[PDB]
Design a protein around this ligand. Structure first.
Ligand code: HEM
Ligand SMILES: COc1cccc(OC)c1O
Length: 402
């Protein structure tokens, strides 16, 4: 118990979900590594500390308590050594840049057009549900082999898994404050199994181009497949973050550009600026804000704190990307910010494996949107509300045109 941080005792989970920025602005100044009682964990809040923990030889991957309750073992994000190496070898082939470039265009662009065609002549839309999330899940779902799971269902799954994974509040004793908050996630996993089990049955006997078929078969001895219980936790990882984050990234990018109308106009007139707009969007509101963690494997001193071996540290990358030691006025979206390293994809050997793919999905989606609707205007009838501490993004993005 750190005396000068006694105010952290009164920080609530709801506060952090609704708006973590004021608390984390204090943390970055007072204690870049600090134990947050309601989270039951140390959290790293600055760019220097997050990067150090994520790349340190004295830390390894771990899942948070709520995250482990949600995904089980072996979730690619929470394992190390030979298991992690196998899971990385499993997912990396379809994410290799040279491979992505072979097909990303023909994958994403027809999908973006299909969802645009449903509303581009309406003069109003809610872009999160009508465009950003559907493009994100349909693109990845087709790649995975889930062509027959409609986008409504994929979006419901990642929303349920998100809430379950981020169900992190703990009581004074150290147990979960909402032990009922995992039930929704359990139901999503059961629905996922009902859909994927027969697909796995088929792929074992009849492999095809779908990523999950390749997860079963790639690198295995002849006639063998990875056991479904061995790959399911990484399937869940995909059906949460991989499904959710590209849509949140493009939506937050749009919110940011709306907040700088001159910059929105710039990007519409010159869509070669879209990659830069997206990189700034991810820094400005990081889709994975504080979901992942590491655990120390030996005593280590971090930000003046002597940590024993076995100490978990939550990586609040969304706070690190507002580090005022790194950025000028980081709370503002600025397309013309000098390109600088950011931590929205994490760091170290557990950094995002899908960066190149994710950036193209978001790029192609915004290219088609601005081409279809050059005169997008935000519905200023209300402000944009963001939600989430673990994962963060706009809950809706109402716009008009014409
Ligand atoms: C813009 C959207 C995305 C963002 C912001 C993003 C950000 C991340 C972050 C922060 C992590 C954790 C890194 C750490 O703890 O240091 C991550 C891990 C990962 N992401 Fe991405 N991700 C994104 C889209 C994807 C997509 C679409 C895929 C799959 C196609 C993907 C596959 C991964 C995988 C497999 C891991 C686990 C890597 C490991 O633990 O070894 N991500 N992502
Ligand atoms: C906490 O859950 C996650 C963390 C990082 C990446 C994920 O999906 C790729 C993901 O589902």
């Amino acid at each position: 118990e750190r005396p000068d941080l006694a105010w952290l005792d009164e920080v609530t989970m709801t506060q952090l979900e609704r708006n973590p920025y004021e608390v984390y602005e204090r943390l970055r100044a007072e204690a870049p590594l600090a134990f947050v009682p309601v989270l039951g964990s140390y959290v790293a809040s600055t760019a220097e500390v997050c990067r150090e923990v994520a790349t340190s030889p004295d830390f390894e991957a771990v899942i948070t308590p709520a995250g482990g309750r949600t995904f089980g073992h072996p979730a690619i994000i929470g394992v190390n050594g030979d298991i992690h190496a196998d899971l990385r070898s499993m997912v990396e082939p379809a994410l290799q840049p040279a491979e992505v470039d072979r097909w990303i265009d023909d994958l994403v662009r027809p999908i973006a057009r299909r969802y645009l065609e449903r509303f581009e002549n309406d003069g109003h839309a809610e872009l999160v549900a009508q465009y950003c999330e559907p493009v994100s899940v349909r693109s990845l779902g087709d790649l995975l082999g889930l062509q027959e799971v409609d986008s409504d269902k994929l979006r419901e799954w990642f929303a349920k898994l998100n809430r379950s994974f981020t169900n992190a509040a703990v009581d004074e004793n150290g147990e979960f404050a909402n032990p009922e908050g995992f039930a929704e996630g359990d139901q999503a996993k059961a629905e996922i199994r009902a859909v994927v089990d027969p697909l796995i049955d088929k792929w074992i006997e009849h492999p095809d181009d779908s990523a999950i078929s390749h997860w079963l078969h790639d690198g295995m001895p002849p006639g063998q497949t990875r056991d479904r219980e061995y790959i399911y936790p990484t399937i869940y990882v995909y059906l949460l973050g991989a499904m959710q984050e590209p849509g949140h990234g493009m939506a937050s990018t749009l919110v940011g550009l709306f907040s700088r109308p001159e910059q929105l106009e710039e990007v519409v007139d010159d869509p070669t600026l879209i990659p830069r707009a997206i990189a700034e969007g991810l820094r400005w509101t990081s889709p994975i804000w504080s979901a992942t963690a590491r655990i120390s494997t030996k005593p280590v001193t971090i930000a003046g704190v002597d940590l024993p071996a076995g100490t978990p540290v939550m990586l609040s990358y969304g706070s690190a990307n507002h580090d005022t030691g790194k950025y000028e006025a980081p709370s503002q979206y600025d397309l013309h910010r000098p390109p600088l390293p950011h931590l929205a994809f994490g760091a170290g050997n557990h950094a995002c494996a899908g960066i190149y793919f994710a950036n193209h999905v978001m790029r192609i989606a915004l290219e088609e949107l601005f081409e279809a609707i050059p005169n997008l205007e935000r519905d200023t009838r209300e402000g944009v509300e963001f939600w989430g501490w673990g994962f963060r993004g706009p809950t809706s993005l109402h716009v008009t045109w014409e």
